Amino acid sequence: MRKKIFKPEELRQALMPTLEALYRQDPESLPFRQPVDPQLLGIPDYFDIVKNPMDLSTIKRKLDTGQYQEPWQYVDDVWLMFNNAWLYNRKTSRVYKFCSKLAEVFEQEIDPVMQSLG
Numbered sequence: 001m002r003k004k005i006f007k008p009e010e011l012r013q014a015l016m017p018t019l020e021a022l023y024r025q026d027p028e029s030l031p032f033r034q035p036v037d038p039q040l041l042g043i044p045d046y047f048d049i050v051k052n053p054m055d056l057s058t059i060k061r062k063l064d065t066g067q068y069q070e071p072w073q074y075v076d077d078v079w080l081m082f083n084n085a086w087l088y089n090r091k092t093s094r095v096y097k098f099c100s101k102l103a104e105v106f107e108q109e110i111d112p113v114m115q116s117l118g
């Protein structure tokens with residue numbers, strides 16, 4: 001119940017490999033690498049449906065700038081990114097299928113890391 005203290009440099013070192021695993025997926029990571037601009041992309045309802053957008057570059061910036069206090073907050077951001085994509089996109093779309101592949105990759109990477117951090 002009393003939270004152990006995680007130093008930001010320890011979270012960055014431990015969790016960065018799991019984020020690198022996502023980024024290295026090609027073609028599957030491409031639509032997830034940067035924040036979206038709905039007006040430029042032609043999806044103007046995106047922020048109506050997706051209340052809390054999330055993307056790989058934003059997660060990397062949060063690790064780089066010490067914005068997570070505990071590892072589950074990082075896991076929550078990765079899964080927010082996944083859940084937003086499964087909510088917004090149709091099941092036949094590239095983004096939807098790519099999201100499913102990233103979730104498979106992430107599940108394998110994150111488990112031993114979460115065990116090691118405690």
Ligand SMILES: COc1ccc2c(c1)N(CCC/C=C/c1cc(C(=O)N3CCOCC3)cc3c1N[C@H](C)CC(=O)N3)CCC2
Nearest residue numbers: 027030031032036041042043084085086088089093094095
């Ligand atoms: C869109 O899929 C691909 C697949 C491969 C490659 C793509 C794009 N690009 C452009 C990358 C940037 C694209 C992002 C992105 C774009 C659209 C989008 O404007 N749409 C309208 C018509 O097309 C389908 C949907 C939707 C979504 C998008 N992503 C985030 C997760 C928000 C979302 O939930 N959905 C680079 C080369 C490889």
